[PDB]
């Protein structure tokens, strides 16, 4: 009984590799 | 340019994986949807035939020729008049049972008839539950071999990571292709499925209530 | 109510410019 | 073993907990599937063998010894007729008030089979909620404790940090490992679960039905 | 070890502090919230199964008085709806239907004030499980504008002055997601342990209803 | 605003609009908290005085002592008694007729009564929605405008580009101040106006009872 | 400014969207007029009612403008003509006709209703949609671009960003519809449901004066 | 009623791909 989508395990994986693209 | 036969021949088997389940979902879209439109369409019809006025008996003599071709709410009239008619038949000792044996038939045929009329939706409600976080994975695996392979090269040389790089992206993207086309048609045929169940429920009760006052008028 | 808005716009006012001063000083 | 097995300094707890949940859903899934599917089955045996001429007395009777099997449906048929005969000879009170305690008994005895029914398809739940929730928690600690714990201040020699960076990005990829199952279950499951109390409601009406006609009559 | 707030710009504090002290907040009501619920569960099976204990219907009340004040749960729907019951019953109340309707009137708002009371600090559970990722993205993406505006004053990839705001990058996601957890652990349980409780409260209702129906029409 | 200033007007032109969405957001928040949580606890006081042993009549008397000031459910009462009374003067409608008229009137002051308290509300749900969508707006834009001017110089690896990206992601910093304290308002003044609903609901139907039963009795 | 130079499939979804884009404006201004619209008329006609004119001036009145009736009277109307209808054949019960009745109002409803919005879902479903057709659109121009930075290897510092804005103005005009189909939706959700409401009570008090009082006549 | 925020998703792209160049 679920009706909804997360987002934020996505945006967060692709936020990390900008952090870590930085250096 | 397919840009494919380049992976660990994993993150591939990631993406043939989700665009099957795409293909299965439109497919089970457009089966649904024509099913559910044509019981909308009988939906009306049976409701002003009824009610046009006429009675009970020859509705019933003009049903019970057409028994297994019968669907939706002819199915559940056919039954639950058998029911009724078998019943009245048989007990003979019902002064206000033969009432609650007839809604028991409509309610057991109703159940069987929603099983039958929403089949397919609880799969579309599962691969739109699940379609970001497999993707999410593929894309995490393929980063993984692209850095697990960046640990020899001299000075880190970053652009020489492209293509693994670049296909886990593009995993992650086709990875969240069926999220959203299945959630999406999954609320909106479920909308229809709930107002249609509706209609089947006023149905109901009204074919109850008529039932109540006039089956012991014989 | 319309005076009482403006009451609360100010306070709200205040507390942006204070915040925007914080952010100020911060960079 | 596939690639290392090092177990770094939180990867002790992290990655572990982890594995615990991964095993937990794995065998739950079918321990729950088997028992399910088996209290299906029987339910539908008794309910469509519950339409026979057999009266109350004689199957009660009947399934007075079976006692230990004697659970689902059954469960609910034994429970209600025994507080009925109690209180029926116990005739202290209207006729009409023995269906209190009639549905006292059915629906506690629902509850009672919905509970060990249940079991964990709330844990279920709960780790197809928080398993990228873990696998995130702990994969930027890594990194972190990784380069602010750098040798020099600057270190242009950087080609030792990326492995680094992965092996703490394998919290990630663990946690939500476990997702794909937990939904999963949950949620297919989940429907079967709403079959089960719906048809169980049916048949505590059935029983409700019943014992308020024939105690007027019996 | 713990080297925060030291190395702190105004804003990543301010959101270190608006969701710390904000999840030990989000424990405690775990706490507080378990507590309640099981107190209460521990007694429903034993009221309940008082109800039909050979307890006829005056003696209950006569023996709920003793802990008047200190009354929760079903008992005190009890007393309240048996009170106000009685006090009605005691002058004229002619109307059957009329001292029915009161005892509806009176057993389901003491029900609703039993659930609500108890029913407490809930709906916060899943605000912080909504925006405490979000809160924790806005200090990340703030840190990497900071530190990215500032890199374009220098041309080599000096990488010296960025890893203060790397920190803050992850500092902020960290704490963002650190409160996640819990919020989703309380919301879904005790929502539904809640629901659980409504409904053998509403089983209450419609059951003791029907007894001072019966009542009713028996004097 | 050190770093702000950005060429392109559009920049400058969104983020003021968003700093006015913050404004009312805010003053919306606070206003119609304060007035709500007044509000609450006269329903409550209400519904202990209006039981506590009293005559209605005496509340009505006590209630146009409070004229032309009046809010809650008091208003309510005042409204569905005067309507009880003008329309039970002699010669009009039957007694069973009169406590219709009275129930409208009693809902249209209730109706009124929810949107006069709910006046900015959904203002909170339209702002939450579009704020996020809106700062993306922005900086898509803005790093239209910076790739365009970096299409044309040569070199310049990542050193100049700062801005015309960074005053972009300053957009979505924006619409993510814009979203967060806006939904959550939202949510929660819908649980409790609902709650508000559902007690001034509740009353009018006990009090439609009470009126039916004066006219029972008068 | 660059459709002419965007591919087929990007010239395919940008066209789509500035399509979806315009209809959306255009069943805001649409609807919304017509919403505020049947909120007056049945604003008026509930005043109108309990007026003390009779039903039967009242089904007079609506057949000097049935065909252009539109509005809640029409409710008012079908019911009315039903009741008569029904008993026009005195072979039935007090409580027969009243169920019919309802049915007779309750269709009229649902009629009323698929009238009163008939693009809310396709609002809806666009705003859910957009931003994934935003997807499309720069996955395929990235991947276009990408083709040509695998054909020629230099490192490309310069000659992608314009290629990357090109496909990032697909999103950006997928959002820009996305927002005034996000802030209608809603918007105009919760008006239809006040008038749902509205139309309930009225459809609720007119079978409990038709059972009760038009029994006899 | 929910924040949704998924078109960013773009924007992570365009940010990611500008550096391996």
């Given at each position: 009984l679920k009706s909804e989508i997360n987002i934020v395990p996505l945006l967060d994986v692709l936020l990390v590799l900008l952090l870590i693209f930085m250096a | 340019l397919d840009l494919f036969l380049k992976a660990s021949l994993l993150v591939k088997l990631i993406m043939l994986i989700l665009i099957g389940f795409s293909i299965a979902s439109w497919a089970i879209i457009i089966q649904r949807t024509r099913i559910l439109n044509a019981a909308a369409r009988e939906a009306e019809?049976?409701?002003?035939?009824?009610?046009?006025?006429?009675?009970?008996?020859?509705?019933?003599?003009?049903?019970?020729?057409?028994?297994?071709?019968?669907?939706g709410s002819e199915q559940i009239?056919?039954?639950?008049?058998?029911?009724?008619?078998?019943?009245?038949?048989?007990?003979?000792?019902?002064?206000?049972?033969?009432?609650?044996?007839?809604?028991?038939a409509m309610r057991i045929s109703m159940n069987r008839e929603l099983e039958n009329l929403e089949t397919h939706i609880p799969f579309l409600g599962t691969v739109g539950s699940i379609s970001?976080?497999?993707?999410?994975?593929?894309?995490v695996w393929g980063i993984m071999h692209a850095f697990i392979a960046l640990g020899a090269v001299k000075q880190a040389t970053l652009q020489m990571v492209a293509p693994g790089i670049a296909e886990a992206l593009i995993?992650?993207?086709?990875?969240?292709?069926?999220?959203?086309?299945?959630?999406?048609?999954?609320?909106?045929?479920?909308?229809?499925?709930?107002?249609?169940?509706?209609?089947?429920?006023?149905?109901?009760?009204?074919?109850?209530?008529?039932?109540?006052?006039?089956?012991?008028?014989? | 109510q319309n005076d009482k808005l403006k009451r609360a716009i100010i306070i709200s006012a205040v507390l942006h410019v204070i915040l925007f001063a914080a952010l100020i000083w911060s960079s």
């Amino acid at each position: 009984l679920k009706s909804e989508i997360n987002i934020v395990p996505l945006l967060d994986v692709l936020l990390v590799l900008l952090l870590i693209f930085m250096a | 340019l397919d840009l494919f036969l380049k992976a660990s021949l994993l993150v591939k088997l990631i993406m043939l994986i989700l665009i099957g389940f795409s293909i299965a979902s439109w497919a089970i879209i457009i089966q649904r949807t024509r099913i559910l439109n044509a019981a909308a369409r009988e939906a009306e019809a049976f409701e002003d035939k009824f009610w046009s006025g006429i009675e009970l008996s020859r509705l019933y003599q003009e049903s019970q020729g057409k028994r297994d071709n019968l669907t939706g709410s002819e199915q559940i009239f056919y039954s639950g008049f058998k029911e009724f008619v078998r019943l009245h038949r048989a007990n003979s000792h019902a002064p206000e049972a033969v009432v609650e044996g007839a809604s028991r038939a409509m309610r057991i045929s109703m159940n069987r008839e929603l099983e039958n009329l929403e089949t397919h939706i609880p799969f579309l409600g599962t691969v739109g539950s699940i379609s970001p976080y497999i993707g999410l994975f593929g894309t995490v695996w393929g980063i993984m071999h692209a850095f697990i392979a960046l640990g020899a090269v001299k000075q880190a040389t970053l652009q020489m990571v492209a293509p693994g790089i670049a296909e886990a992206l593009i995993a992650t993207a086709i990875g969240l292709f069926a999220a959203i086309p299945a959630v999406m048609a999954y609320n909106r045929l479920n909308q229809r499925v709930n107002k249609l169940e509706l209609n089947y429920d006023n149905f109901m009760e009204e074919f109850t209530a008529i039932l109540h006052r006039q089956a012991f008028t014989v | 109510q319309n005076d009482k808005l403006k009451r609360a716009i100010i306070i709200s006012a205040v507390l942006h410019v204070i915040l925007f001063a914080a952010l100020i000083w911060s960079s």
